[PDB]
Amino acid sequence: VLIPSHAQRDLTGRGHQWLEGEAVKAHLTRVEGWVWKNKLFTLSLVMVAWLMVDGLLPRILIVVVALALAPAYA
Amino acid sequence: VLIPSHAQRDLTGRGHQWLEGEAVKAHLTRVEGWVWKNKLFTLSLVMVAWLMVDGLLPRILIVVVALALAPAYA
Amino acid sequence: VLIPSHAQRDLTGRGHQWLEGEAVKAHLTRVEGWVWKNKLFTLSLVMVAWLMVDGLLPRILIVVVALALAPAYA
Amino acid sequence: SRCTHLENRDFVTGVQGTTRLTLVLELGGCVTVTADGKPSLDVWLDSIYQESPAQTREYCLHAKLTGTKVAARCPTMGPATLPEEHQSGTVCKRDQSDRGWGNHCGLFGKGSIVTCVKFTCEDKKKATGHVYDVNKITYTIKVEPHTGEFVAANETHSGRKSASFTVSSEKTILTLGDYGDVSLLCRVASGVDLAQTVVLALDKTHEHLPTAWQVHRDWFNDLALPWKHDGAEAWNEAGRLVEFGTPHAVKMDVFNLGDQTGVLLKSLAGVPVASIEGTKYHLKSGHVTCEVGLEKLKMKGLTYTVCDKTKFTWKRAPTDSGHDTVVMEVGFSGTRPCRIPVRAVAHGVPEVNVAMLITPNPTMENNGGGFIEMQLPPGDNIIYVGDLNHQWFQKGSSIGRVLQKTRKGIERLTVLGEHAWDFGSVGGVMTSIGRAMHTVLGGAFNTLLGGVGFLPKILLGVAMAWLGLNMRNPTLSMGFLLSGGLVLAMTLGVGA
Amino acid sequence: SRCTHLENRDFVTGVQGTTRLTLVLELGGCVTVTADGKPSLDVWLDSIYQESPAQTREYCLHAKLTGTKVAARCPTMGPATLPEEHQSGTVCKRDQSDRGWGNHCGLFGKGSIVTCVKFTCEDKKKATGHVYDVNKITYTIKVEPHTGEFVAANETHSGRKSASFTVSSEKTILTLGDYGDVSLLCRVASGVDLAQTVVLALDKTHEHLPTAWQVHRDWFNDLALPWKHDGAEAWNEAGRLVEFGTPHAVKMDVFNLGDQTGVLLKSLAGVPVASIEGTKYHLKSGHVTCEVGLEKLKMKGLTYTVCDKTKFTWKRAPTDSGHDTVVMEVGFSGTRPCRIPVRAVAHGVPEVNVAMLITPNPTMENNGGGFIEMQLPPGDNIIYVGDLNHQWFQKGSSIGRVLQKTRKGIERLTVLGEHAWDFGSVGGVMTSIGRAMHTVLGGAFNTLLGGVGFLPKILLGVAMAWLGLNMRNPTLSMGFLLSGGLVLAMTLGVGA
Amino acid sequence: SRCTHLENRDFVTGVQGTTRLTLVLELGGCVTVTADGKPSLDVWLDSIYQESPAQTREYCLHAKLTGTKVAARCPTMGPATLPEEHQSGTVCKRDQSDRGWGNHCGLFGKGSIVTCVKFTCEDKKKATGHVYDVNKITYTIKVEPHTGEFVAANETHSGRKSASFTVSSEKTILTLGDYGDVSLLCRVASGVDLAQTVVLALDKTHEHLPTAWQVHRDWFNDLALPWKHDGAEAWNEAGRLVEFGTPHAVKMDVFNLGDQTGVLLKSLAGVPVASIEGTKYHLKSGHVTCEVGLEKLKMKGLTYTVCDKTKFTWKRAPTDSGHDTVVMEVGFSGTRPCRIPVRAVAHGVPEVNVAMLITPNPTMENNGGGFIEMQLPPGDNIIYVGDLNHQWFQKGSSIGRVLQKTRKGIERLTVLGEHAWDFGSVGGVMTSIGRAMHTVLGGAFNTLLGGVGFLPKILLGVAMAWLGLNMRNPTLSMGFLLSGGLVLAMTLGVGA
C-alpha cells in the first residue's frame, strides 16, 4: 500500500499548520546537510564531469541536476 | 604576561598527555568549523586564484596556504 | 576554552581606560623577542629571499612581511 | 570656574542677537560659552547613571567539584549507566575502555565506562552582566557663571547650578540670581547607544581592581564559560570548565581547568572603566547633545561706580594658564561694590587696547571677587589694573594658535564621530555636507570592516593598495590605492 | 604473564643458539622474550625516580599587595621622592601629572608624581621547578617467567622478581627458582635525557589536578613572571604582575593582574604528566637500552609423563587476545605432575601441528597451572588437548600480518627516536647505517627547525617545495624539492 | 525417504576410490548421496538454533504522553525554566513566543515559552533485538538410509538418526542400524556470518503477524526511534515521537506522532522470517559446509534368495516424481525375506538393461518393504518387476537434461555465494580458478558498491558505458565500457 502526500496549492490562510509542511526549505537543508556523509561520491562525480564535458559553461552547469537528485538515492 | 604555547616535539612519549594539543589532527577540524559557519569564505579564495594564477601546482599551493592560515585572520 | 580579544572601534568616550592595546609599537617587541630566541634559524628566511626574489623593493617587502608574521604563528 | 581646573576646554561665541547655541558635551570635558555683550558661562556633563539596573547572564570563572562516581561494563553487556546522569548540577562523560581477563572480565576487547561529578561556582568567583534601561537613565548637566570669585577643586561654590534629565523632562529654566535665568534642553535619545552596551561586574571586594568595565554587547554573549540567568540553582554548559583523562580498565580521572580570572582581565584590553556607589551605576565615558539658550542673561553691575585707580594690590601675580590665556587676582581696600578698570597695551603703541577679557564687566562685591582671565597677542605686553602695572611676554606665535585649535578639532572628531559637526552649529550648507559624508563613509567602513582586528586591517589595507599598484587599469588602480589608503587611515592614521 | 594485562606488547626471537638480546624497554610497555628450546620470559620497566631532587627557579602566579603610598611635587618644584624607592620587596613608578591653582600649585603645567607598593606571593600560589641528578636516578626493571599459572592484575604473583639499577651499578643476576638464572645489564647513559627535562610542581594538595608536569628545560627559563631562587626574602621583576593607572592630579591607582593559574594550565597542553608520591618524584615516560643474556635458563619438567587423555575439561574457552594470539585455560583430575599434549591442525591438510606455543612444555602441577598461549595461521583450524577439541577461525591475512608489524615498527621509530635501531642483537651493516643516518638527519632538523610551531614548519616545507618547482638549475631545483619533502616528513609523521 | 517430499532435491555421485564427499546443506533443502556398491542415504539440516540468545536494544513504537507543564516570561524578564527540565524520562522544548501589552506584558516583542511532557512506551508496543552467541549455536543434521519402506511427511520413520553440532564437536560416528556406520563433520564456524544478523521480535500475542524477522545488523542501528537496554527507566532520544505546535502567547501544544508499527512492517520488505518455541530461537535460512565419510557403510540382505516370479502385484503404479525419477510400490504374496528382480528395456534394444536404480538390491522383509525408485533414458521404455510389466515414456532429451542441471547449478551459485564451489569433492584445477575469480570479483563489488539500491546500480553502470561511447581515447573508452558493463552483469537479475 501507499498514501502519497500533496503540497503547494491546497494553501490555507495565516493559521496554524501541521508539522513541517514545506518542500524547498526541506530540500535545501537536506542537500547542504548531506555533504558530510560521503565526500568521495560527489567528488568523483564532479571529477568525471570536469574531465568528460567540453566547454566550461556546460561543465559547470550540468552537475547541478545530479546533485539536486543525489539525496533521493543516498 | 604572554606565556606562549609549549612546543609539540619535545618530551614525546607513551604516558598520559595532559590535553589533546594543536597538531594538524586537531587543526583540520578548526578549518572545517570556520568554513561551515562562514559558508562563502572559500569562494573568493578559490575563484580569484583560479582566474589570476598561471600553473596548476603554484595555484593549488597558494589556495592551500590561504585556507591553512584562515582562523588566524580574526 | 578560549576567550576572544575584545579590541576594536570600542565605546571610546574619552575617560580612563584599562591597559592599552598591543598595537604596532608593541608588536615590534614580539618580533625582536622571536629574532633573539630563534636566532640560528633567522638567516634562512633572509638567505632564501636574497637568492629567490629579483628587485630590492619586493625582496625587502617579502622579508619584512615574513619576519612581521612569524611570531603570530611560531 | 571649572574650566580653569581641567585638562581640556573648548570656546564658543555667539554674534549679537544669537539666542541659541548647540553643544556636544563629553564627560570630563567642559565648554566656555560666550556672546557679544552677555555674561560668560562654564557648562559640563557631570554624570550618566541609573539605580539598580537589570541583570542578564551570570558566568562562573572557577569551578568547584564534589562526590564523583564511576561505573563500567564488559564488551558484551551493553552500555554502563548511573542515576546521576539524570539530575541537576551534574557533569557526565561516557567512553570506551580496554578490558581483559586480568581485570576479572569475561572476554578481551573494548568495554564502556561512564563518569559523573557535581558542579558549582567557587563562592565569590561569579561574573555578572548588567544592562541600562532607556526609560530610567539619568543624565546630569551643570552650569556656573563667571562670578569673579575663585574656589578650589575640593571646595563647593554657592553659585553652581544643577539639573537632571530623563525621557520625561522638557526645556528647563535654571535661575542664577542677579545674572537672571538660563534655559537648557537635552535630547536623551542622542546618548551612547544602550544596544551596544553592557556593564560587567566582578567581586567588589578587591582593593586593587576597577569595580566595573564598559564591555560591548556582542562580545559578552559569545563568551564560552559556564552560565545561567538569576534565581536558577543549576548551571548550563558546566562541561566547558572540566575535562576527563584517558580511562584505565576500572577507573577514570576528572581534572579542573582552574581559575580563569587572568584570562578574562587580559582579554578586556583597552575597554573603558565604570564605577559603583551603593545602588548607583555610573558610566565614565560618553557624550550628550544639548541646546543652551542665551535668552534671559543680565550683565551684572552696569549701574555700579568705577574704582579709585590707586587702592589696588596683587593677591596672585600673572601666570600662564596652559590653555593660552593669562590669569591673575587683585585685592582692593576702598568702598564696595565697585567696577574694575582693566586694559592691556602692545609695547610700542600706548593708545590701543588688546585685552580680550573672557569675563565681561568684572567687579568687586562685598563677599569676594577680583579674578580675571584674558587673552593677548604674541610677544611683549604691559597689563594695567587701576594704576598697577606689570610686564609680560606671551609665548608662541599666531601660526601656533591655529595649529593647536586644528589639533583639538581633529582629536574631537576621532572620538565623537559623526556627531562632531553639531558643535557651535549655524545654518550654513557645509554643516549638511560634513554630516552626510561622515554618515556615508562611516557607514561603509563599519559595515564592510568594523569587526576586523587592527593588524589584519593593516595587512588588508597593504594588500588592497598592492593590488592597486599591480592591476592593469589606471582608474581601478587608483580606486584600489585610495580604498587601501582609507583602511590605513582608519588604523595607522588613528595611531602608530 | 603481565603482557596479557597490557595493550602494548612486542615479541622477540633469538636466532638459533644466540646467547644475548638487546631490548629497548619503554615505559608502561612490555616485551616477551623467546629462543629455541628455552623458557619464555616477560621483561618490563616499572619506574624511573629519585628522592629529594635539586630545586631551581620559583615563580609567583598571584601577587598580593600592601602598604601603597604616593607623593607629588608642584610644577618646577623638582622631582618627588619616598624612602621605599631604594628598598627591596616593592614596586615603584614615576610619572607626570597636570597641576594648577585649583589644586594648590603656584604655577600651571606638568608636575611630577611617584608611587610605591609592597609585593608578595599568596601563601600557596607558588610554582616550583625540580631537576634530576645523574648520580642519583634509580631505574626499576622487573622480570617474570611464563609459569603456566594465571594471576589477576591485582594479585601478588610469587614468580615475579625485581632489580634496581643506578649509575653506581650495571649488571645483576636474578634467580627464577626452578627455571635457573637470568642475566641483565643496564646503562644509565642512553636513558631519558636529564639535561633537557624539568619537573614542575604547583600546590600538591588540590584533589582534581595532576601533581606535576614534565616541562622542557628551555621553556622554564624563557617565561615572563615574577621569580626568585630559594630562601630569598624579595622577588625579582615584580613589575610583571602589577600595573598602574594614568595619574590624576594627586593620585595614582595600583592594579593587580590577578591569578595566572589558568593561563599556565592552558599553556602546557601536550606535555606528559609526572607524579609525586611521598618523597619520591617518578617520571611516567622514558626508555632504557638493556642487554639480556639467556645462557643459564633451564626448561622445567622435561622428564614427566603425559596426562590421561580422558580426564581434561575446559575452564575458559579459546579466546582472542587482541595481540593476534589465542589463550585458554584447562582443568584436570589425574595424578597432577604431568605434561599436556597440545596441538592444532589447519583445515584441508593432515595433522601437521600448526600451533606455535609461546609457553613451552605446559604441565599441570600440585599448586595449579593449566594456562596456555599460542599463535595460529589464518583461516579454519581445530585445537586439541587430549580428548577435548575446539574449532576456531583466525582473522586477517599473510599480507595483513606484515602490515601490522610494519605499523608497530613505525610507531617505535617515531616515539623513541635514534635508539629504535638498537632493538634486536642481529647487528648487520644496515643497523649501523640507520644509526649513523638518523644521528645526522635528525640532528639537522632538531637543531635548525626544532622549536618552531607545527603549522609554520609545514608552511616553510611548502615554501621550499614551491620555490623548488621554479628554480632554473636542475640540481638546486631537486635540492629545494627534497628539502620541502623532508620538512613535511619531519612534521607530518608526528601530526596524528 | 525425505528427499521425495521437498522440491529443492539434488544428487551427489562418485566411486569408492574416494570415500570423503563435501556437501553444502541448505536449510529447507535435501541431498541424496550415492556411490559404487555402498547404499544411498538421505541427508539434510533440520534446524539452526540457540536457547535464550543475548538481548540487546529495545525500541519504542508507540509513545504515551502524560503530565505536561507550560511556563512563560515577559519580553526582557529573562528566559523561563521548569524543575521537569532536570528529571529522567521527560521531553522538553524552549521557544521565543510572541507577547504584547494586551497579554499582560509591559512591552512589545519576543518573550520566552518552555514546555515539558513525561514519556513512556505503551505496554506490549516494544520492539526487541536478539543476537546469537558463536559458542552457543546448535546446528542439527539428520540422516536416514533409503530403506525401501515408505512413510509420509506425517508419521515418524523408525530408521532415522539425528546428530547435534556445536563449536566443541568432533568427527562424529552415527550407527545406522543394520547398514553399519556413517561419519559426519561440520565447519560450524563458517556457516551463517553472525557479524551480520539480528533477530527482531514484536509482542508474541498477535495472530497474523510473523513471530520474528532476520534483520541486518547495520540497519538495526540506524532506526530513528527512542531506545534503551534492559533494567533502565529512562529512554534515550525520547523526543523522536513528539513535536510541538508554533506557540500561542501563553500555550504550546504537544502532538503525539502516533503508533509507528505499520511503518516498521512496511520497511521490512524482502527480509526472511524466524520462529520461537518457548525458549528456542530458530533461523529459517542459511547453510553449513560439511563432510560425509562413507568408510563403514554396509549392504543388507545380499545372502537372500530371489522371489518366485508369479506372486507379485502393483500397490502404487509407476508415476512421475516431478524430479526426473519414477517411483513405484509392489505387494508380494510369497515367502520372506527375499530379493525383488527389477529391470527396464529400451524399445528395440532387448540385449541391455537400462535401469539406473537409486536404491541398490531391493528386498521384501517380514514387517515391510517394496518401494523402488529409478532413473530411465528418454523416450519409449518397458519396466519389469518379476513377470509383471508396465509401459512408459520418459520426457525430455539429453540437451534439455544438461540445461536442467545447469539451471540448478546457477541457482546454487546465486544463493550460496563463494561457498558454491564446495559441492562435490572435485579435485580438478579449474575449481580453484573459479573459486578465486568469484571471491575476488564478489569482494570487489561488495566493498565498492554493495549497499547501493537497484536503480542507482543500473544508472551507474549505464552512465559509465555511455561516457565510454563518448570518450576521445579508445583505451579509456574501453575501460569505461568494461567497468560500466560489469556492474550491469553483476546486478540485472533482481526484477521490476
- Taking the C-alpha atoms of residue E324 and residue E342, their distance in angstroms, rounded to an integer, is 19
Pick the CATH number of D3-53+132-194+281-297 from 2.70.70.10, 2.60.98.10, 1.10.287.470, 3.40.50.300: 2.60.98.10
List the one residue out of E292, E18, E3, E297 whose CA is nearest residue E163.
E292
Per the CB < 8 A criterion, the answer to whether E107 and E4 are in contact is no
**Is residue F337 reached through a cis peptide bond, with omega within 30 degrees of 0 on the bond before it?**
yes
- Give dist(CA E43, CA E474) in Å, integer: 52
Among F47, B7, D361, C11, smallest CA distance to E220 is for B7
Asked if F236 and F297 count as a contact pair (C-beta separation under 8 A), the reply is: no
* Closest alpha carbon to D134 in D188, D57, D212: D188
The answer to whether the CB atoms of B18 and E269 lie below 8 A apart is: yes
User: Hey, is the C-beta of F440 within 8 angstroms of any chain E C-beta?
Assistant: no
Give the other-Cβ count within 10 Å of B45's Cβ: 15
Pairing assessment for the beta strands F181-186 and F242-244 based on DSSP bridges: unpaired
Phi, psi torsion values for F375, nearest 5 degrees:
-115, 140
Q: How many CA atoms does the CB half-sphere of F212 hold within 13 Å? A: 21
Planar angle of CA E78, E83, E89, nearest 5 degrees: 125
Residues ≥6 apart with Cβ < 8 Å to E433: none
Amino acid at D228: K
In this structure, are residues F313 and F331 in contact, taking their beta carbons and an 8 Å threshold? yes
* Inter-CA distances, C21 with C25, D416, E17, E191, Å: 10, 20, 73, 47
Q: Does F338 contact chain E (CB < 8 Å)?
A: no
Beta bridge partners of D375: D356
Closest CA to F58 of F130, F8, F137: F130
φ, ψ dihedrals at A9, nearest 5°: -135, 15
DSSP symbol at F324: S
Report strand pairing: F10-14 vs F31-35.
parallel
Whose grid coordinates read 577540524? B29
CATH 2.60.40.350-classified regions of chain F: 312-395
Give CA–CA dist F266/D431, Å, rounded.
76
Give the nearest chain C residue to D451 (CA atoms).
C8
For D487, the 3-state DSSP assignment is helix
Rounded to an integer, what distance in angstroms lies between the CA atom of residue F361 and that of residue F146?
Answer: 11
Cell of E267: 599553556
**Which CATH architecture best describes the domain E63-121+235-259?**
2-Layer Sandwich (3.30)
Residues A49 and A65: beta-carbon distance below 8 Å: no
- Residue E64 to residue E122: CA distance in whole angstroms: 6
| Cβ neighbours, 10 Å, residue F127 | 22
CA–CA distance, E67 with E115 (Å, rounded to integer): 11
- Distances in Å between the alpha carbon of C63 and those of E53, E155, E388? 46, 65, 78
* Residue (of E465, E466, E458, E459) closest to E494 by Cα position: E458
Neighboring chain D residues of B73 at a CB cutoff of 8 Å: 456
The CATH architecture assigned to D312-396 reads Sandwich (2.60)
Taking phi over 0 as left and psi of -120 to 50 as alpha, with beta for the rest, D456 belongs to alpha
Residue type at position D66: T
Of E216, E264, E496, the CB nearest to B10: E216
Q: What is the CA radius of gyration of chain C?
A: 17
> Which residue in this structure is represented by grid cell 638480546?
E21
Structural resolution in Å = 3.8
Residue for grid cell 530371489: F306
Considering only the beta carbons, identify the residue of B1, B16, B73 that sits closest to D266. Answer: B1
All three cell numbers of D134, joined, read 532607556
Q: Cα(D465)–Cα(D474) distance, rounded to whole angstroms?
A: 13
Q: CATH 3.30.387.10: which residues of chain E?
A: 63-121+235-259
Determine the Cα–Cα distance for residues F413 and D429; give it in Å rounded to an integer. Answer: 95
What residues does D175 pair with on adjacent strands?
D181
Domain with CATH 2.60.40.350 in chain E: 313-395
The count of C-alpha atoms lying within 13 angstroms of the C-alpha of D494, restricted to the half-sphere facing its C-beta, is: 17
Tell me the three-class secondary structure of chain E, residue by residue. Answer: CHHHCCCCCEEEECCCCCCEEEEEEECCCCEEEECCCCCCEEEEEEEEECECCEEEEEEECCEEEEEEEEEEECCCCCCCCCHHHHCCCEEEEEECCEECHHHCCCCCEECEEEEEEEEEECCCCEEEEEECCCCCCEEEEEEEECCCCCCCCCCCCCCCEEEEECCCCCEEEEECHHHEEEEEEECCCCCCCCCCEEEEECCCCCCCCCCEEEEECCHHHHCCCCEECCCCCCCECHHHCEEECCCCCCCCCEEECCCCHHHHHHHCCCCEEEEEECCEEEECCCEEEEEEECCCECCCCCCCCECCCCCCEEEEEEEECCCCCEEEEEECCCCCCCECCCEEEECCCCCCCCCEECCCCCEEECCEECEEEEECCCEEEEEEECCEEEEEEECCCHHHHHHHHHHHHHHHHHHHHHHHHHCCCCCCHHHHHHHHHHHHHHHHHHHHCCCCCHHHHHHHHHHHHHHHCCCCCHHHHHHHHHHHHHHHHHHHCCCC
Q: Looking only at Cα atoms, what is the longest distance across chain F?
A: 118
Query: 3-class SS at D190?
Result: helix
Q: How far apart are CA E310 and CA E299, in angstroms?
A: 27
Whether residues B9 and E469 touch (CB distance < 8 A) is answered with: no
Burial of F305 (0-12, 13-18, 19+ CB in 10 A): exposed
Nearest CA distance, F253 vs chain D (angstrom): 25
Q: Which of E28, E37, E3 is nearest to E11 (CA)?
A: E3
Question: At CB < 8 Å, which residues of chain B contact D?
Answer: 1, 16, 19, 73-74
> Is the Cβ pair A16, F455 closer than 8 Å?
no
Those residues with Cβ within 8 angstroms of residue A61's Cβ, 6 or more apart along the chain or in another chain: none
E456, C70: Cβ pair inside 8 Å?
A: yes
Q: Return the C-alpha cell found at E367.
A: 599448586
- The C-alpha atoms of residue A36 and residue D407 are separated, in whole angstroms, by 58
Task: Flag if E245 and C44 touch (Cβ within 8 Å).
Answer: no
C-alpha cell, D67: 562526590
Domain borders along chain B are: 40-74
Provide the CA D234 distance to its chain's centre, in angstroms. Answer: 37
In this structure, are residues E70 and E81 in contact, taking their beta carbons and an 8 Å threshold?
no
Q: Amino acid letter at D393?
A: F
Mutation for D interface: E149, E208, E275, most D CBs within 10 A: E208
Which long-range CB contacts under 8 A does A53-61 form with residues at least 24 apart?
none
Top-level class of domain F10-52+132-193+281-293? mainly beta
Cell digits of residue E228 = 626568585
The architecture in CATH of the region F312-395 reads Sandwich (2.60)
Is D7 in Cβ contact with E98 (below 8 Å)? yes
How far apart are the C-alpha atoms of E182 and E368, rounded to whole Å?
24
Contact E371, E329 (CB under 8 A): yes
Backbone angles phi, psi at E60, to 5 degrees: -100, 120
Q: Which residues of F355-367 are buried (b: 16+ CB within 10 A; e: fewer)?
A: bebbbbebbbbee
Strand partners, D287: D26
Cα E454 to Cα E458: distance, rounded to the nearest angstrom: 7
Phi then psi dihedrals of residue A22, to 5 deg: -135, 160
Q: Match domain E313-395 to its CATH number in 2.60.40.350, 2.130.10.10, 1.20.1060.10, 3.90.76.10.
A: 2.60.40.350
Query: Hunting for cell 633567522 — which residue is that?
Result: C42
Distance CA D396, CA D375 (A): 13
Secondary structure letter of residue D360 according to DSSP: S
Q: Is F76 exposed, middle or buried (0-12, 13-18, 19+ CB in 10 A)?
A: middle
Distance of CA E28 to the CA centre of its chain: 8
Which residue type is seen at E318? Answer: P
Q: What is the largest CA-CA distance in chain D?
A: 118
How many angstroms separate the CA atoms of E8 and E29, rounded? Answer: 6
Residue of B nearest to D267 (CA): B2
Cross-chain Cβ contact B74/D452 below 8 Å: yes
Q: A11: left (phi > 0), else alpha (psi -120 to 50), else beta?
A: beta
Distance from the first to the final alpha carbon of chain C? 21
Amino acid type, E167: V
DSSP result, F394-452: E---HHHHHHHHHHHHHHHHHHHGGGGGGSS----THHHHHHHHHHHHHHHHHHHHTTS
> Are F355 and F343 within 8 A, CB to CB?
yes
Integer Cα distance of D297 and D175 in angstroms: 10
- HSE of B35 in the Cβ direction (CA atoms, 13 Å)? 17
Instruction: Say yes or no for a CB contact (<8 Å) between E150 and D101.
Output: yes
If one looks up domain E1-61+127-225+261-299 in CATH, what number appears? 2.60.98.10
Closest listed residue to residue F1, CA positions, set F148, F106, F215: F148
Helix (H, G, I), strand (E, B) or coil at D61: coil
Using the Cβ of E495 and the Cβ atoms of chain B, whether some distance falls under 8 Å is answered with yes
Cα E40 from Cα E359, distance rounded (Å): 6
- Bridge partner residues of D126 (DSSP): D60
Q: How far is F370 from chain D (nearest CA, A)?
A: 57
Q: Give the Cα separation of E473 and E468 in Å (integer).
A: 10
Q: For an interface test with D, give the residue of E155, E259, E265, E321 to mutate (most D CBs within 10 A).
A: E259
CATH dotted code for D63-121+236-258: 3.30.387.10
Q: Which residues of chain D form CATH 2.60.98.10?
A: 3-53+132-194+281-297
Q: What distance in Å separates the CA atoms of residue E387 and residue E406, rounded to the nearest whole number?
A: 39
Q: By the 8 A CB rule, do E325 and E373 touch?
A: yes
The CATH fold assigned to F63-121+226-259 is Viral Envelope Glycoprotein; domain 3 (3.30.387)
